[PDB]
Design an enzyme around this catalytic site. Structure first.
Site, mmCIF file in Angstrom:
data_model
loop_
_atom_site.group_PDB
_atom_site.id
_atom_site.type_symbol
_atom_site.label_atom_id
_atom_site.label_comp_id
_atom_site.label_asym_id
_atom_site.label_seq_id
_atom_site.Cartn_x
_atom_site.Cartn_y
_atom_site.Cartn_z
ATOM 1 C CB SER A 1 -5.397 1.967 -9.279
ATOM 2 O OG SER A 1 -3.890 2.118 -9.264
ATOM 3 C CG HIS B 1 -1.270 0.136 -5.854
ATOM 4 N ND1 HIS B 1 -1.985 0.742 -5.030
ATOM 5 C CD2 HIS B 1 -1.244 0.678 -7.197
ATOM 6 C CE1 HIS B 1 -2.355 1.767 -5.565
ATOM 7 N NE2 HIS B 1 -2.258 1.743 -6.906
ATOM 8 C CD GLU C 1 -2.380 0.425 -1.178
ATOM 9 O OE1 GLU C 1 -2.446 0.400 -2.421
ATOM 10 O OE2 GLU C 1 -3.112 0.376 -0.312
ATOM 11 C CG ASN D 1 -5.737 4.833 -4.934
ATOM 12 O OD1 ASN D 1 -5.349 5.620 -4.987
ATOM 13 N ND2 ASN D 1 -5.486 3.986 -6.261
#
Lengths: 285, 285
Positions: free
Chosen positions: A120, A141, A153, A192
């Site tokens: 991340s 992800h 992702e 995020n």
């Protein structure tokens, strides 16, 4: 073509969830950690997760046994030489991730193999540049709890091979049964990058005495129909984790609203990290 | 102490929603519009609404008629003289709201009566400043669809009387069954001040080609468990309403991330307002 041999490096929360969902989908999984202590803590996480799933009637006893039968734990990196897809989920530290990708790239010799990072916070191109074959490297992800949340992702770098990305997308969709979202190698990707600034703005309202913790969360659940308000959700994410993503987003984009607010800094410094420490915006007994 | 006589000024979507939910709660309601054409539009909104709700099992045949029995429509503002609470939901224009509040103040003579605005875009102190008893004025902000979403924001100005605020909170909670969130008189209050910068950030992602409309919405629904992703939601809020709220937040706080991005501006200029025009981020047949 199709992926049947998966490797996972790292056996914290995320690494353990990634291995669990791959074994429950019927893939051979080899989990690597450098030390026997870390293997056993990883195995115990998966065993306990699968025991809860059985107690709640979501998986049978035979399914649980079949999943465990497909998991191999090792401290020898050469046991990963035959993998088609390896997923790294270790500590969010650039130098530790670069050394692991240099060594994976040497040992995993199938030219069709994919090396993926769950990071991340580190740019994917930086871990790709640690290898001699950067076209095999991408971001994949996942989101805790990995066995439940039906999303990944998929992040292409500047040099990710198109066929490597297509194989990975087909694996995530067809085998793991997840939705696949594509984006570019930018701090925070999609999820995020929308979530963290929203949580930060809630923290700023609380800090300025403009509304209470309880009223912000109430307003969001009733008015927006979210399952959970932003301060409760910050506590679940972890206030240390939130601070780290915020710091990386500020460093990349330089806009002040990406930066951690002073109240969040003071809470991290006091050890008030949310649900995992016993307190953040709320108390957990 | 206790409210039984409510006035509503305006019979657009919000006003008709506020009148419906008050009548279903068993309170007496007068709806005012100046022109008889606007009146017929309103009754029909409410009857359609109550029918679509009997259709889907939600209310006893006679309840619908008890509710209709408690609604009175008028084109004479002096009929609101006996009201304990009057809620204004007219066009978002400072000069229009000002005239209405000055007249309301003269017509409603009880000093314990409350004059409340549903506005999103004008400061509550400005509409209060147009009356001779500013201490009677506050914000009471509802969310569409008003008979579903169980929330109001109760916004005190610098001078709102304590008694007026406590009586209003008691009406919203005890009679309408809504959750009540308090805040100060600041652009966006609580809900819109969290929502709108989040929606604008999604639009900027789409504008820069960083991810598709469908991928951003997919990621939020699967990743954050929201019922609807941010571009679908923008289309449902209305892109004109979104532009207006962003413009006011930027004028109040002056931070660039509050301002509407160029793609939102072009879309509004083209008449692409979302669901209500037939096209926004998506097409609607």
């Amino acid at each position: 073509d199709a992926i049947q041999r998966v490797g996972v490096v790292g056996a914290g929360q995320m690494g353990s969830g990634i291995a669990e969902v791959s074994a429950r989908a019927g893939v051979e999984v080899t989990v690597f950690e450098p030390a026997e202590a870390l293997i056993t803590a990883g195995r115990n996480r998966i065993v306990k997760s699968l025991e809860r799933a059985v107690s709640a009637g979501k998986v049978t006893e035979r399914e649980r046994d079949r999943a465990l039968g497909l998991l191999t734990f090792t401290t020898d990196l050469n046991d990963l030489s035959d993998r088609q897809l390896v997923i790294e989920a270790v500590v969010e530290d650039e130098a530790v991730k670069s050394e692991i990708f240099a060594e994976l790239d040497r040992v995993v010799t199938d030219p069709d193999a994919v090396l993926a990072s769950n990071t991340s916070s580190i740019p994917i191109m930086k871990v790709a540049a640690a290898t001699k074959q950067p076209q095999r490297v991408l971001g994949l992800h996942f989101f805790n709890p990995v066995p439940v949340l039906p999303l990944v992702e998929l992040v292409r770098t500047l040099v990710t091979d198109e066929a490597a990305a297509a194989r990975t997308e087909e694996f995530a969709s067809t085998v793991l049964g997840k939705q696949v979202v594509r984006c570019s190698d930018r701090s925070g990707f999609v999820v995020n990058a929308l979530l963290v600034p929203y949580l930060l703005s809630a923290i700023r309202m609380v800090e300025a005495g403009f509304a209470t913790v309880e009223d912000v969360d109430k307003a969001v659940v009733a008015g927006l129909s979210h399952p959970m308000g932003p301060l409760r959700l910050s506590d679940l994410v972890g206030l240390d984790t939130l601070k780290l993503i915020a710091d990386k987003m500020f460093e990349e984009f330089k806009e002040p609203h990406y930066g951690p607010p002073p109240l969040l800094l003071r809470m991290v410094e006091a050890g008030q990290l949310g649900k995992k420490s016993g307190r953040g915006f709320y108390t957990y007994a």
